[PDB]
Design goal:
Blueprint lengths: L5 E2 L11 E7 L12 E6 L2 E5 L1 H4 L3 H8 L4 E4 L2 H9 L8 E4 H8 L8 H6 L9 H5 L10 H28 L3 H21 L1 E3 L1 H26 L8 H11 L7 E2 L2 E2 L3 H7 L4 H26 L6 E2 L2 E3 L9 E3 L11 H4 L5 E2 L5 E8 L2 H10 L2 H8 L4 H10 L8 H14 L5 H8 L3 H14 L1 H17 L1 E3 L5 E3 L8 H37 L5 E5 L3 E7 L3 H13 L10 E6 L7
Parallel strand pairs: 1-4, 2-5, 5-6
Antiparallel strand pairs: 2-3, 3-4, 7-10, 7-13, 8-9, 11-12, 14-18, 14-19, 15-16, 17-18
Bound molecules: a molecule of 2 linked components (GLC-FRU) (2 copies) and magnesium ion.
The protein binds a DNA duplex (10 and 10 nucleotides) through helix 10, helix 12, strand 12, helix 14 and helix 17.
Length: 580
Amino acid sequence: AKMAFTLADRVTEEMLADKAALVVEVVEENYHDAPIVGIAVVNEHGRFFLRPETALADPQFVAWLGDETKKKSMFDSKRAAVALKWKGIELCGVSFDLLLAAYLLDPAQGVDDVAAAAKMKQYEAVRPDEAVYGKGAKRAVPDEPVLAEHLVRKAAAIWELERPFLDELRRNEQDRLLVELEQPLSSILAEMEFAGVKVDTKRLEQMGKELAEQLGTVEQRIYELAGQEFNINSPKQLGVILFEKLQLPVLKKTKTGYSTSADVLEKLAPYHEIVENILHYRQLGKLQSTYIEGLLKVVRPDTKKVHTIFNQALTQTGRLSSTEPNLQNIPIRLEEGRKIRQAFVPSESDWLIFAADYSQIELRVLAHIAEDDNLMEAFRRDLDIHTKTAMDIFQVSEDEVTPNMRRQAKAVNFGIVYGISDYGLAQNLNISRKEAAEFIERYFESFPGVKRYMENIVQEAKQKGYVTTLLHRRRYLPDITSRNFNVRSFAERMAMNTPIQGSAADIIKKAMIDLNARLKEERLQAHLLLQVHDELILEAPKEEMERLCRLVPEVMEQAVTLRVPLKVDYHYGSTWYDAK
DNA sequence: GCATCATGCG
DNA sequence: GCATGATGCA
Ligand SMILES: OC[C@H]1O[C@@](CO)(O[C@H]2O[C@H](CO)[C@@H](O)[C@H](O)[C@H]2O)[C@@H](O)[C@@H]1O
Ligand SMILES: OC[C@H]1O[C@@](CO)(O[C@H]2O[C@H](CO)[C@@H](O)[C@H](O)[C@H]2O)[C@@H](O)[C@@H]1O
Ligand SMILES: [Mg+2]
């Protein structure tokens, strides 16, 4: 049962073949400046295990790692690449990443280790990482004999599985998606994460002080209005104060009691002065806990930078996700929270932050896919799409569109991209199911192509078992055939939404690749820092702004060619906040 | 660890 | 529609 391999004490030529499955193991979940615990190499000559302090000090091995002509097959190459970057070592030649391959074949599998990807092809001669390392804090690196065999078995699985995975990707028409989009993007994300974003800690601390002061005042006021103290952060204790001691009406409940969601308190506001204070308390509380205290906990004490990790193989639609910290959900809606962005500054003196965002990319993608004449014309005229929708569904001229009409039309546009149900829209606009249904019907009468698309995509999902995006990303929807209305409807909404949200993801990902190629050709110092679904944030010398003002929008606008143009807005400033 | 709440794009 | 993080409670 045991797998044979050479536990080498030194690097040999045999280990430097031009094709190999490579494992550069980083156990710590956050791989930034993290230890490399072992290395495994499997190639035509055999299976090998190398101690990191040995291999990484070896000139020949380091050169092999950085030789683009020496191809390597790996699992989560970004993790290895970044861990190596922190050690001043360059990893090149990665031609196949099993994590990304598994992710494209089926995002729903949740593949997060070699064992999980291998099980997809009935290969089980490798143990799950959790089984070897354990979970929680009790997660430690085992003794060399156990560690070495595990790394070798993972390398062996990768070595064996590359062909079958590539073959299936090819069958799915996803070969270029892996090789020309996701794998090249992985390297770009690695550079972004490694570069990090500089944070003005002093600014954050000051804000923390001011918030703590405002919180104390709002908190005290709340007890003053309740006639007693209690844990406002406790939905249980709060519910007792609102619906029992204060007798506020119950407009909706929760599984474990009464509902105190923002959707509820907003309606209870007129009944008691305490509600507005609770909502405000929650706003400030979120800024203090997650964006002030939380951000400060992950800022590197020396460089004062934060190094997020973009999970490239998690979302069911093809989007990236961000953690430790999540730099894709920094406040911007409310001024008080938007101020947080003043804390994100350029990493060098005399540099500025440049941000470019796609304008209505999802609705433009919908116009393209549905080939709706009315919607395509609206974007060809670059009209305010919400005002346009209002004009159509409410049957009025532009001058007759009131602010309330535009607000409701905007809610309709948000919901249409995922076939929002009448109940879903009714809740968002706080109206009846019938009224919401009338809005939707009015929308379909004005945009018949979109109605046709929603009908056709659901049927396609049922016929094929999955839906696809512009660049051939796919998502299986087995629930589309369920006899349970709720479960089936949810699958139907996913069928309508995935091609839209997914294609928008495809487009910005390609723009990122195209952009880096352009920056390199022009030898600009500018570089990417973050991506937030519809936007790209970079930093660069103040002397490069004029060139970026022309280059970035163009690359993003020309990433793909649709039936409607793509529009990109951009801003730059001394801080992320100022890049508006 | 599940539930509820907040934040982002839409 | 798609995400992450902090909190309370058990
Ligand atoms: O390295 C990122 C890559 O690893 C996975 C597991 O294979 O996620 C791990 O690392 C993330 C970043 O620290 C953690 O959020 C996650 O909990 C941990 O398992 C993949 O999901 C990801 O693509
Ligand atoms: O009236 C048909 C209409 O209903 C939807 C759901 O909104 O689909 C239902 O009917 C289809 C048969 O035409 C089934 O395939 C599907 O499973 C069922 O939910 C729309 O897609 C369709 O336009
Ligand atoms: Mg935008």
